[PDB]
Structure formats: C-alpha cells, structure tokens
Subunit: 459 residues, 4 copies
Amino acid sequence: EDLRRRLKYFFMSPCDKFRAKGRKPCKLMLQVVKILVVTVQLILFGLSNQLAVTFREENTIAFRHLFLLGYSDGADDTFAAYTREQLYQAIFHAVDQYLALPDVSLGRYAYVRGGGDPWTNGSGLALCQRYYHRGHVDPANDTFDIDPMVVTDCIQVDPPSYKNLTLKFHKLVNVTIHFRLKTINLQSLINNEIPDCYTFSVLITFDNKAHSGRIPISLETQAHIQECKHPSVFQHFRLLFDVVVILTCSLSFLLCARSLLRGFLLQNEFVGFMWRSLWERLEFVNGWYILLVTSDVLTISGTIMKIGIEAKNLASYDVCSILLGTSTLLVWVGVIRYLTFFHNYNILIATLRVALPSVMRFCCCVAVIYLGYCFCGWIVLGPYHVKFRSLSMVSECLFSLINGDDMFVTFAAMQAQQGRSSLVWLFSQLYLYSFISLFIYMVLSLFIALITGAYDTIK
Amino acid sequence: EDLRRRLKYFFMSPCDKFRAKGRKPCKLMLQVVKILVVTVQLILFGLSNQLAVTFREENTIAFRHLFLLGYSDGADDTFAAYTREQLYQAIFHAVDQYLALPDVSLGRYAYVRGGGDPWTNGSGLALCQRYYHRGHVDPANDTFDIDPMVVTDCIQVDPPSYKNLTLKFHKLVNVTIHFRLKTINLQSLINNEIPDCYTFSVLITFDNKAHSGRIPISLETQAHIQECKHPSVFQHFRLLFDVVVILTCSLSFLLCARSLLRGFLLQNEFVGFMWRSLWERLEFVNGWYILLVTSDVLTISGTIMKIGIEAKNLASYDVCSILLGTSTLLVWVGVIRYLTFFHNYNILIATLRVALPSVMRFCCCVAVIYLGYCFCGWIVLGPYHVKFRSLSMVSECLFSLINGDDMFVTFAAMQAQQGRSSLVWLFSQLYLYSFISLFIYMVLSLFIALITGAYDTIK
Amino acid sequence: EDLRRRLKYFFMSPCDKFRAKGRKPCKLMLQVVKILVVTVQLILFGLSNQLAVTFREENTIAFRHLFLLGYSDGADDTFAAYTREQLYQAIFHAVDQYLALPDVSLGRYAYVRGGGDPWTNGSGLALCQRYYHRGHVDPANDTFDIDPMVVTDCIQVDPPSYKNLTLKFHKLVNVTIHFRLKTINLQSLINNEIPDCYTFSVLITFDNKAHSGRIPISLETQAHIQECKHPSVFQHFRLLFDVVVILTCSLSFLLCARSLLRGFLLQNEFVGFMWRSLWERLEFVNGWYILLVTSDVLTISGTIMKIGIEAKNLASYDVCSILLGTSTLLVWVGVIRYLTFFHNYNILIATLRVALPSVMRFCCCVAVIYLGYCFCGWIVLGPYHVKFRSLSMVSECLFSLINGDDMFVTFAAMQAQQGRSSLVWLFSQLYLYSFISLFIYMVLSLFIALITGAYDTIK
Amino acid sequence: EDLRRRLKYFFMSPCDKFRAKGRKPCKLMLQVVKILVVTVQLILFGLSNQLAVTFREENTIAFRHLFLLGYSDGADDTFAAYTREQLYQAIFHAVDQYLALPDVSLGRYAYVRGGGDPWTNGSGLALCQRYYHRGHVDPANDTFDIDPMVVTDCIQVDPPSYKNLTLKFHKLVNVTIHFRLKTINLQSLINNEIPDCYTFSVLITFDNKAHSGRIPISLETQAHIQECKHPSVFQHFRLLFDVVVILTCSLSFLLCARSLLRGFLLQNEFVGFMWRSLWERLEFVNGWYILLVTSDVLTISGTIMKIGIEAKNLASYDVCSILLGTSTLLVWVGVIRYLTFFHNYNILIATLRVALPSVMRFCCCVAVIYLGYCFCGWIVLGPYHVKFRSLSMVSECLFSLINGDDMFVTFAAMQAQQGRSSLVWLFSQLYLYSFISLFIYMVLSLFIALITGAYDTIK
Ligand SMILES: CCCCCCCCCCCCCCCCCC(=O)OC[C@H](COP(=O)([O-])OCC[N+](C)(C)C)OC(=O)CCCCCCCCCCCCCCCCC
Ligand SMILES: CCCCCCCCCCCCCCCCCC(=O)OC[C@H](COP(=O)([O-])OCC[N+](C)(C)C)OC(=O)CCCCCCCCCCCCCCCCC
Ligand SMILES: CCCCCCCCCCCCCCCCCC(=O)OC[C@H](COP(=O)([O-])OCC[N+](C)(C)C)OC(=O)CCCCCCCCCCCCCCCCC
Ligand SMILES: CCCCCCCC
Ligand SMILES: CCCCCCCC
Ligand SMILES: CCCCCCCC
Ligand SMILES: CCCCCCCC
Ligand SMILES: CCCCCCCC
Ligand SMILES: CCCCCCCC
C-alpha cells in the first residue's frame, strides 16, 4: 500500500521531491558551496606549500653549487671523479667551502655542533672513509685476500688536519662528508606568515662500491622544520575560512548520514515485506553519499592538519596537500550524482555500470601477461636499457608503449648493443615487437570493444 | 499558394536558382575572390610583422650576451649567482658594458637620460637595491627581528661611484638595473618601408626573494615604436590592394545582409500564415551568412588597422595579425556553405549538426571530473613537477595525456621524488594511472561512439 | 557465342588460365625475379651513393671546425658574434686558417685561383663587405639619411693586407669569405671504384641584415664532382648485373604491353557487339599492368643513369637514387596483382576500391579548413613559434598534431609569450585547442568511419 | 558407448573432473608454485647479472675518461680530431696515461704482456698505423697513383720511442692502440659471491677511412671473465632453491607429458572408431601443455646454466638471462589455460582463435608494401636521415610512425636538406606523407576491423 509510494518517493529526483512534498534541496546547494570553498582552501594552502618546497629545493641547488667542485646544472647523473687527484681536490674543496661559508655564501647559515654520531662534541663536519678491514688485491697474480668487514675512520672539523687525509684506494668502499646548517625561511613574510627555522642535514657521498675506476659524487639534504624562539615581525581570515569549511563539511556529512540511515530503514522494511538477495539490498545504498561522507572526512582531516601546520604544531605539508587535493577531486566529482537522474546527461555512469564487470574479468586474463612482460623486461633488459632500471619504471614504459608513446626512443636505446651484445639486442627486438603488436592491436581493441558494446546496450 | 513556391525557391541551391530565375551566383565568385585576396593580404602583412618581431627578439638576445656575465644560449632558466663575489662581478659587468657600449657593440644605440623614475634628470642607468627596513637575522640563536617594509636605495649613472655599492645581503630583497636604449630598425628598407625608431627599456633583475643562497639573474626588454623625425631614404600598391580588399568585403557584406533581410521577411510571412516555435523560426536564419558578415567585419577592421600601421599612426602588430588571421580562417571555412547542398559532400556538417547536442551534454559531466583533476594536480604536484607549475600548463599536460602524448616523460619527472618524497611519488603514480585509464579508455571511447552513432544516423 | 567464353578467359586467374589452355605464368616468375634483382641493384647503388654523400658532409663538418673560431658541434643555429672584436677575430681566424691549411689540416687540399668573380686572376680567397652607399644613422636625434644601394668592397688573398680591413659597422649589410678547395675521394677504393676529384666552393657569411647587434655566422659548401686526369690504381660484374636488370624489365614491359593491347582489342570487340559507357570500357584496362610498365620505365631509366654515373659521364646521385628507390617500391607493390584474385587475400584493395570516392569527396570539404588553419598559424604564430616558421613546417606540425604527436611541446613553446605577448598567447591557446579538438575527434573519426563502412560493405 | 563419456570427461574442467572422479588438481597448484619460484629465481639471478654488466660498463666509461684527451660524457658520437696537432696530442695522451695508470687511476689494474699479435713478447701496448703501400695524391694536378694494399707499421711499448711516431697523413688509413688490463670485480662480495678476475682488451681507434679531414676517435672494450687463483674471503641456499625449481619443473613436465600421451591415445581410439581430417585430430592436442613443456625445458636449461655460472664453470650471463626471462614470461602466460574454461574470462583467446587466420592473410598483402617502403627509405633517405641509417632502424622508424610516434621530428630531420638537396627533400615529403596516410588510415583501420569483427562473431 503506502510502501510502493514511499519507495517511489525515495527514488525520485530533487525536482520531483520538491514537486511532491515541497522539499528544499539543501544538499545540492551545499555541494555547490563545498566545491567553491574547498577549491579556494586548496589554493590558499598551495601558497604556503609552494613556499616550503621552494625553500628546500633552492637551498639544495645552492649547496650543490657551493660544495661540489666543477658542478654544473644538469650534471647530477654523470658527476664523477676519475683520478686520485680529482677525488682529493673534490674532498678538500667541499671542506674548504664549508669553512669559508660565512664569507662567500649569499645565504645566511649557522653552524651546528655536537649531537649524535658521526659528530663528536664540538665538531661541525665529519669526514669519513669506509674501507675493508683487510684488503690485499693482486690482479697481477690473480689473487686476493679480503675480510669484507667495513672499518670507518674519520676526521672531525670544527667550524671557524683534514688535509692529511690518506685514502686507501685499493680497498676503499666510500667517502662521506656530513654537516648541518641552520637558516630561516624569510620568504614566508610575503604570505603574512611567521618564518620558520630550518635545519639542513647535508651528506656528500663519493661512492666506490663498484671498484670500477669511476667514483660518482652526489649531494643530498634532509630538512627539519621547527618554530623559532620568540621571533619579532613588525605588524606580524584563514582560520575563519577553515572553520567555515569545517562547518560546511560537517553539515554535509550529517545530511548524508541521515539519508543513508533513511535508506537503510526503508531497505529493512522492504525486506520484511518481501519475506512475508544481497544485490536487492545493496540497491538501497546510495554510493554517491558514501563518496560524499568519505570526502567530508578527508576534508575535515586536511583542514585540521592545515590549522595545526599554520599554528606551527605540525610540518607535514605533503600529507596535508594529499588529503586536501584528494578531497577537492572527490568534491568536484560528487555533483554527478544529480546528473544521474537524466539519461541524456548520464551516459558515462550508465555505461560504466554495465561495462565494469566484464572489464574486470578481461583484466584478470590480461594482467598475468602484463606482469610476465614486466618481470622479463626488468631482469633481462634492465642492465642495458635506461627505461627498464626498476620495476615501477618498467611498468611506466610498458604502459606508455601501449598508448603509442615514446616508441622509437625505446627501440633506439638498444641500438648501442647491436654491436656489443648481439643476442641481447635480438631478444630486445623480439620482446618489443611482440609486446607492442599484442597489446595495441589485440588487447586494447577488445577492451574498447567491450566498452562500446556496453554503451550500445545502454543506448 | 505562391508561398510554397517562394519558400522552395528560397531553399534552393545556386545552380537550382540559376535554372529557376536565371540568377547569376555573384556571392560565390565573391567568396572565391575573397579567399584569394584576403590570403594574399595576410601574407603581405606577415612580411612586416616578421620584421618587427625579429628586430625586438634579436636585440633582446644581443642584450643578454652583452650585459650578462658568462651568459650562454639556452641558460635562461638556470642562470644564477651563488657567491657574493659572483653577484658583485655580474652587477659591475653589466654597468661597465653599459658604459662601454658605443665602442664594443655591433649595433648602433643612443642613450636616454632623465624622464620619470627610477632615473633622475641627466641619469641614464639606475642601479637599485631593495631590502627590509629592519632585518636582524640570527639562525644561530633561532631568532629574528624584521620590519618587512621595503627600502629602495639606488645609484644613478650618467652615460659616457657605482663601484662603491655595498649589498645588505642578509636582508636583501633584490637588485635591479634599469636603462633605455634607442635604435633604428633599418631592415625595413628591404620591404620598401621607412625604418621605425625603437626605444628598448631594459631591466636586469638579480632576485633574492627566496633567500635561499641562489640568486637567479634575468634580463627583460620592453619595446616602444615611434616614427622618426624627418627621415630621408633615397627613392623611399599595398594601399590599393587594401582598398580592393575593403571593397570586396563591403560588397560581400551588403549581399549577405540583403539575403538575411529577405530570409527574415519570408520568416515573418510564414509565421503569419501559420498563425491564421522558436526553432521553426531560426530555421530561416542562414548561419553561414552570419559567419560571412562576421568575417567581413573582421577583415575590414584588420585592413583599417594595417593601413594605420603602414601610415605610422599605429603600432599594434599583434592585434592586426590576430584580426587578419582569424578573418582568413573564416573566409576559407565559408565556402563549405556551397558544399552543404550536396549530401555526398556534406558528411561533416550533417553529422556535426546531429552530434553536437549530445556531445555538449556529455561534456557537462566530463568537465567537472577534468577540473577536479586539474586543481588536484596543480596544487599537489606543481611544486614537484615541471609540467604542473601553472593551471594552464596543467590543462595542457592533461589534454596531451588524453591524446597519448608525452606519457613516459610525465611519469619520469617524478622518479626523482621516489627517494626523497615517497608519499608524493606514490600519490603521483595513482593520480596519473587513474587519470589516463579513465579518460583514454572510458571517456574518449564514449565521445567517439557518440560521434560515430550520429554519423550512422545521418547515413 | 565465343565472345562470352573469350571474356571469361580474359578475366581468369593464372592458375585458372593454366587449367584452361595450359598457359605457363611467365609474368609472375618475372615479377619475382624483378623483385630480387631490382632490390639487389638498389642496395649495390646505395653503397656508392653513401660514399659520395659521406664525403661531402664530412668535409663540410671539418671545414666548420677549421675555419669558424670557437665552433662546436650542435651550435649551427645559434653561432653568432656580439662585439666588434669578436667579429674581427672570427674574420681573421678564417683567413689565417685558410692560409695555414697545408700545415694543420688532416685532409689534403689544393687551392683554386682565378676564375670568375669574386676572385681576381691569381686570387684564392675573396673577403667582401657589403654596405649601404650612403648611411647616416642618428638614433640620438631620431634621424637617418640612407641611400639603400649596396656597395661591395673586397680584398683578394693569394694562397701561400686583409689585416687592414675596416668594417663600416653602422651601415654594414654583410661580410662574406669565398674560396675553393680541391680534394680526392679516396674512400671509393673500398668499393672497387676509381676515386673522383671534388671541388668544394666554401662560403662563410657574417650576416648583419637585421642590424640588431647580433651577427649570425654560417659556413656552406657546394660540391662539384669531376673525373681526374689519367689516374692510376694498382689493379683498378656490376655492368652485367645492370644489363640483366635491363633485360628483365624489357621483357616484363613487352609482356605487359602485349596484355594491354589484347585487352584493348577485346574491349573494342565487346563495344562493337553491344552497339549492334566510359566506365564499362575502362573495366577492360588492367591498372596493375599500367603500374608495371611505369615501374619498368623507371627502372630502365635509373639503370641507364647508374651506368652513366659509374662510367663517370654523370654525377646526379640524387636523381638516380630517387628513380631506383621509387621503382623498387613499385616492383614490391606490383605482386598484389596476383593476390587480387582471392577474396580472403584481397581485403585491402577491395575495400579501397569502394572507399576511395567518398574519401575524396570528404577531403574536398576538409582541405579548405586545413588550409585556413595552415595560413592562419603560419602568419600569426610563425614569428613566435619555432614549429610555425614556414608553410611546409606548419603543415608538418598540424599533420603530426592530428596524429597526437608532439602536442605538449607545441603548447609549451608558447609559454614564454604568456608574460611578454599575452594576446598572442591567448590566441595560440584558442587556435591549438580548437584545431586539435575539431580534427582528432570529429574529422578523423568520420574518415575512419567511411573506411570501416566500406569494409562492412565489401565483407 | 563408453567412448562418448570418456571424451566428455577428457574435455572437462578441473572442477568438473573433481566432481566426476574426485581428481585433485595438482597441475594447477604446480603452476602457481612455478610462477612464484621461477619469478624469485629470475630476480635472484638478476642481482649477479646486474653486478657483471655494471662492472663492464663502468670500467669502460672510466677508460674513456682516462685515455681520451678532452673527452666528456655524451660526446661519443661526435668526438673527433681536426688538425694534425690535435691527433698527435690525443695519441700521446693515450699512451702517457697508459704508462701513468698506476699512479693516477682510482681503480687497481695489472698490465698484460706478450701473447699473440699485435703485441710482441714483453710488450704491453701496441701503437699501429695502417696506410696505403703506395700513395701519391695530387689534387692540384687532379692526379693520383695508388697501390691500395694496406701496410701496418707499429711501435711496441713496455709497461713501466713512441714519441717519434710520424704519421703518413696523405695515405693514412687508420691508427689503433691496443692494450689489456686485469682487474677484480670486488663488488660481488655484497652478494656473498667470490669476486671474478676480469681482463679488459682495450682498442682505441682514430679512423681516417673517409679521408675527409675529420678523424673520429673511439674506444671499445672486450671483457673476459675467469676464476681467480686460490682466492681468500674471510667467511666466504641458492643451490637448494635451484634444485627446488628443477624438481618443480620436472614434475610439471612429467604430468604434462602424461596428459599429452593420454590425449594421443584417446585421439587414436576415436579415429579408429570413426574409420569403422588433420584438424579433427589436432583437436586432441592441448597446445597449452606443449607451451608448458617448452617452458619447463627452458627453465631447467636456464637453471643448469645458472648453477654452472655460480660454480664458475661458465660466464654466459646473457644466454642464461634470456633463457630464464623467456621461461618466466611463458610460466606467467601458462595459467590462462585454466581461464579458457569460462567464457566470461576467455574473450581474448576465443577472439584470437577466430581472428588469427584472416589476420595472417591480411599481413601477406601488407608485408610487401611495408618491405618496399623499408628498402626505398633505407637506400634513398639513409645518407640524409639519422633515423634511416640501417634497415633495422628503418623498420623501427616506420613501425613507430604507424603508431603515431615521433612524427614531427621525422619530418624535421629533413628540413636541413630543403636548401641543400631540394629534390631529396621533396621526395622525403611525398614518401612520409604517403606512408603515414596509407598505413594509419587504411591498413591499420582494416586490421582493427578484422579483430573487432572476430570479437563480434565470438560474442
Ligand atoms: C574479478 C576481478 C578481479 C580483479 C581484476 C584484475 C585486477 C588487475 C590488477 C592490475 C595489476 C597490474 C600490475 C601492475 C604492477 C606492476 C608494477 C609495479 O608493481 O610497480 C612496482 C612498484 C615498486 O617497484 P620499484 O620500481 O620501486 O622497485 C624495483 C626494484 N629496484 C628498485 C630494486 C630496482 O610498485 C608500485 O608502487 C606499483 C606501481 C604500479 C601501479 C599501477 C597499477 C594501477 C594503479 C591503480 C590506478 C588505476 C585505477 C583505474 C580506475 C579509473 C576508472 C574508474
Ligand atoms: C548544455 C551544454 C552546456 C555546456 C557544456 C559544457 C562546457 C564545457 C566547458 C569546458 C571547460 C574545460 C576546463 C578548461 C579550463 C582549465 C584550464 C584553465 O582554466 O586554464 C587556466 C588559464 C590561466 O591560468 P594560468 O596558468 O595563467 O594561472 C595559473 C596560476 N599561476 C600562474 C599563479 C600559477 O586560463 C586560460 O587561459 C584557459 C585555458 C584553458 C582553455 C581550454 C578550453 C578550451 C578552449 C576552447 C577551444 C575548444 C573549441 C572546440 C570547438 C571545435 C569544434 C567546433
Ligand atoms: C598465410 C600466412 C603467411 C604468413 C603471413 C605474412 C608474414 C608477415 C611477415 C612480416 C615481415 C615484416 C618485415 C620485417 C623485416 C624488416 C626489417 C628487418 O629485416 O630488419 C633488419 C634487421 C637487420 O638489419 P640491420 O639494420 O642490422 O642491417 C642494415 C645494414 N647496414 C647495417 C649495413 C646498414 O633484421 C632483423 O634483425 C629483423 C628486424 C625486424 C623484425 C620485426 C618483425 C616482427 C618480429 C616478430 C615479433 C612479432 C610477433 C607478434 C605476435 C604477438 C601476438 C601473438
Ligand atoms: C559512485 C557510486 C555510484 C553508484 C551507481 C548508481 C547510480 C545511482
Ligand atoms: C583520514 C586519514 C587521516 C590520516 C592523518 C595521519 C597524519 C599522520
Ligand atoms: C555555421 C552555420 C551552419 C548552420 C547549419 C545549417 C546548414 C545549412
Ligand atoms: C572588430 C573588433 C575590432 C577591435 C579593434 C581594437 C583595437 C585596439
Ligand atoms: C593499381 C590499379 C588497381 C586496379 C583495381 C582493379 C583490381 C583488378
Ligand atoms: C597456446 C595454445 C592455445 C590453444 C587454443 C585452444 C584453447 C583450448
């Protein structure tokens, strides 16, 4: 009796419900307001996120130019030493620049002393060489006597004896330089924020693990952010905007939870009526509202993290950015729920609903072939091909090849081996040709055929 | 009675109308003449447009080589100073080259003195440093005391004391060098045109807003064009050609307006007959003729601007070029109006007419997803990914990815973060894979399906 | 009566004709032999073609390294002078290297003296500056007085006063250095060929036509090949192979001409029978045999040219290579004539036969849009975009964009103008987005739909 | 009678057979175990394969930096000498560095003396110049007198007179430097493996075969691996894992062979029953089991090779890697055999089975066109186009072009010839446009149509 009318009303559109019981669509206007405010909050956060990331990266580039002898932009991957004299000069240049920093640097840096290892108390720079405990290497007689246990020896340099360093080249594992520098991110002032205090931990590595006559040289930094002690800025909204976002998301969450509860109660009543199928029950679950509550939770968590970062209780910019960006994407996607009511505007969702199961079953069979190719390429071609170094990189290369991207350069990276390793080159030819042909012309064609057949069904 | 015959005649083809009432198709021959003359005028204008653009750009490159110490082509994005000595040397090199310009430069330049700020009367070069009013920075004690108000102090150099410049490095915001140079674009002589007089305003910036120990250095120019005073060229068509273009476009406009008026009158009579639907009225509007009158207006405006530029009353080359190029494109497109009469030649337009509404409705749903991805990528990945720096650049990157372009390099730009920021790298993996899969395999497939289904309908 | 049987036999396959009248298929075996021999001849010619091209290009690169001060590989497009001292040094370096060539060069070169202009009798090198007859340039007073007539003044240098060169910088149009060198292409010995004598005409240009303060510097060569005088090589097939190719092509031509004549006679008889439609007559014309006779003519012409080049009567390697390569492609394509008899192997040709007319009609409408875009892009974007410099380059860029290639870099080349010329940048955005959308999603889709519909018809 | 039931059981699924006769599916669990263990073995082998390849390549790069004067990374393709003084300096630098190696090198190398040619007994380095027996070259008189027989003259250098080298430049064919160095691959210690002893044979070539004034310089190495004599590593699983892989593959092979024999016997019985068609017999052959036995043979061979390499009996890393990688790919693909039983999961295989014959027939016709284009492009464009140098490279370029990849750069590589060789440039335009249009829009469309029509059939 009334159950039929109740269900019919439960599955009606906002305009239909307004016609029926004069219900005002507050959820829709809330969604529009949410899109606006969440996007604005994301951009406002992005300002400070960019400030932090830029400070870290620019300081690291400046360190590379200051401490690496003969360094130039774009040389990171090939920068290396090849003679004993070059290596000694690089090490001494790094240490001398560390000692001269106050007089030459464009930035203002403070020294850090002591702390844990590798620094002794009062020491600012640690210069450590690591070598085998016993190494006797005699290629002339085709012999060696090695105790592979690593011994670390190093020199402590106080900021304003290291020149007596003697490297044990034949059994040298690596050389490292460790030091910390303190600086202040003044640019924050442009965003009406109090500058933070940064500590950069700088590691310079001269790596000899390959014992190949080529020692690559690299510099890396780790940044630690902390609040400064009683700072002063002459004449030192966002909080209220964050509170507004929180209120909007809370109201949206409450309305969506109420709708889900109403749907659950109606589902229970209908099941009781029928009894007097899991899918027939899930038909009462509004997936869009589950997405909306997930988005609200994400947005509130991101806003709380953002408030904490602004208050200087936290410094996890990356997590906050990921939370807020994902929530913004979900908020933008959420409004399709209201287009679902009209067939002329619901082609994408209607087709995906029919296509997805067969697509998943197809992927079941395609994935094992894809993984076989991934592992084979990674292990066989990785030592020779710059695009096959790692499994994730192999997956990227194969996925791009399926889409027709970067094909000729992939083929050409192997041309160097046609004269050196002919068998590997021939294998790479067969591998690439077979993969491209199979996946572009057979697999992808059938995938698209499944999707277009589903569309033909729903149309 | 006669209304049926009149409407049938009104909807007939040029050949059919010639058969019926012996009407000569002057509009079609006018369209052909218009294509020829408008294209020729565009090319002729392009000659002088190229001359102007080349003068500006070549002078700017020469300035970069003259005034930037150690500059080389292709280094614009990374050119920077890293030590106090480097910065002082760059500043003094720029000023010294400015003073030596008459003796060393291959071009002939005249100095400009006085005028508004930043130059005092009689001064040719302004060397200005901008720093915080009060800056006390103490990273050693984790303290600072800042009044962020910017103070500008600068030295005036008369063209043929600046060597005493002392930079306040710890609170320095930036350094700028401003000067103006006058020159003459002699190359115009090859196009039988009188050379113009150019003033180049040159700004060299040493930017320290990030306070990161790396100060990027850049040079920019702004060009002002003016007529020279009583020039003399020994033995100093285009005007007549412009007048011909104007006459052709005016006649085309008159004929198209007459046709539109006739259609409007016939529409009114038919509506009156029926009365004794907005679409049923718009059926009488020839959209091709609206396009043609728009193209005629654009062409006449562009020709008037071109005449003014040739007379030296205007120098807005870019606006003129845009007007004339758009009008040329529209003129070329306009002749499809006559192919519309024959079905075997009207596949594209006939199919678009049926497909466009459903395509627009589909875009309604796709656009919110696209914008969500744009904002998320711009804010989360922009600090780390060179292709996500700006919203327009993000849109370009995503649009290219949809078309399969530049995929692997997009993936590879993030490989540097796999060791530094693992969470951001993982997010970028999920973001790129999900976007590419969704848009290439689901969205684009259904878009093409809509278009091909419309074609199946009209065929 | 007999006419039906005669026609049925005339349209039968080689196996069917062998069954009917025991006819041996000599044309087919001739085609196979032709493929083999023509391909082999192409490769054999390619050996000597490569030798000639390599000699020219390697000599030109060596000249660039010898005569251009500070030249390095890959700098051709940006190599330029920027100060008077740099230009003087480059000019004097080129002349000094010309004079020192016998002592420093790795190649063996002989000087050429006299001849026509610009060299006087006995002169090996001509150093010429071209300037305006009267040039008074006064940017300070915004005035000039120019007689644009070009005066050429130049110095003659005898191979082993030019140091007194005074350049008129303010009215200088360009500077050129002309000289000729003779050398011998010894590498020909590896191919059992007598070396040729080469004369390289070398032109070095310092171009100041833009009067922009930047003078680009370039070097170009023209090679003239001649037989040497009574050469001697101790112990100094291909001719017989060329004769064999000629005989094979002649026999194929004769058989195809006989077949065409037989078809023409049968066509005339059938028309006479019917009389007691142009297409109904062209149905008797074997297009494959027209292609075969064209290929035979091309092959014979190429072989005669190759024999002449080997005999040293000709040196037009490029024309011979084009003739032989085209003939090889046509010979390879010609064997599809025999697959046309079997439907399971004739899908491509059968479908093209049905699709081509509608494709041509579609192209009629698409071409005007494409040309409008070409002209608009060439004139509006060419001064700003490296990929739009020339009309052919614009066509290449747009054709590649239609196929999804190089999209993001096309967008990115304009990002530099977003700050300098905002209006041009906005126009480029609209231009690229509209072109890509229209052509990839609407035009190409309908093109493929036409082809697949034709296939659906023939299947 | 029983034959029908026997055949029906023979063609049932694992679950169906378990229902029928309670058969435990040991082959399927064996396949899962095989996937796991084979993939793990491949990765474990990849560790040592990477160690070997890295040692070889890093040593070669170090040699290039040590022995090539003025060498820098990325200069391999253009590195060349252009004056006699440069060539002498490069030769003497290489020899001097060879003599100074113990004092300057970061690696530890031992000299090799004597052996076969080109070294005499006691000699470590051979410096050999090769020139024509008689060369008189007179370009001034357009004459030459050559005996092309090559004479080799060379100097022996003992490791710690070559300075008196006099090069016969006008008839010089090339110069080579040969020497061998011994070293130890210590990095193996990180993988708990005993280091191997490497001998690097180093060849430095200064090539003058073109006699063009440009002499390219290159360095190449060949590595020979051997076990060292009585090495000692303080405290010097994989064997047991290899044995486990062998056992698993052997059991899988036995089960698959038993299944194939059972199928053969059933086939014979059915044929005997019918007698009282080759395809009707091949219907009894399980192709998946043939694939599985092939994979088992490959895996066992690869494992035996891996054990031999670990024992130091072999050093063929490339062959072992190819065997194991191919076997891993086949093992991953093999599990689709069990998905073949379910139609919803068998779309790919079911469609391929129907599409493959028509695809092969289509390829018959397409291949001759493709080969014609390959040969034409290789011979005509190869001397001018970097992507057409070799036939394999031409095939890669054309295959990539079909897939839309690298189009604009292919067009742009020819733009340099538009001014030099206009006829070749025009031919390249026609060649590229025709190939791309024909193959992308006609051939590929029909290929995809065949595949999708087969899918339409099986669905
Ligand atoms: C009945 C249905 C059942 C389910 C259907 C079948 C499911 C299909 C599963 C697909 C699996 C494909 C294999 C990918 C993994 C291979 C690469 C890999 O592991 O990377 C190594 C990397 C790490 O390896 P690495 O490179 O760091 O280490 C290599 C080792 N060294 C460094 C020592 C050399 O792992 C990853 O982080 C995973 C990256 C791959 C992820 C790509 C898969 C897609 C992700 C989801 C987005 C798509 C959503 C689409 C939805 C949109 C529309 C709604
Ligand atoms: C019932 C039907 C209703 C309508 C149907 C639905 C309409 C669909 C609307 C599409 C909108 C898609 C979103 C694009 C905007 C995102 C990018 C953006 O805003 O850029 C930022 C830029 C500016 O941002 P920015 O990068 O300068 O600033 C970033 C901020 N900083 C610098 C501080 C880091 O804005 C633009 O200039 C817009 C560029 C995007 C334009 C692309 C859209 C297409 C243009 C029209 C051409 C296509 C015509 C096709 C017709 C051919 C066939 C007839
Ligand atoms: C009824 C059916 C009958 C059969 C149907 C028709 C069969 C179709 C045959 C295709 C042939 C196509 C021509 C390619 C050869 C041209 C290039 C060449 O030879 O290279 C030169 C190279 C060597 O040349 P080079 O470049 O080293 O030498 C040039 C000379 N110098 C150096 C002096 C300048 O040869 C090769 O190594 C071959 C490379 C091409 C291989 C590509 C073909 C595909 C390989 C198989 C993988 C695909 C499997 C797909 C299955 C997946 C799904 C199940
Ligand atoms: C994201 C959940 C969508 C659920 C599909 C049903 C549409 C009402
Ligand atoms: C909704 C998940 C929130 C995760 C926050 C964790 C921050 C360390
Ligand atoms: C550009 C306007 C086209 C209007 C479509 C109707 C064709 C007669
Ligand atoms: C038809 C629009 C003309 C715009 C001209 C404006 C130039 C400043
Ligand atoms: C290349 C000419 C082909 C002619 C088509 C008819 C096929 C017998
Ligand atoms: C790889 C062999 C597959 C054989 C096709 C038949 C499937 C049972």
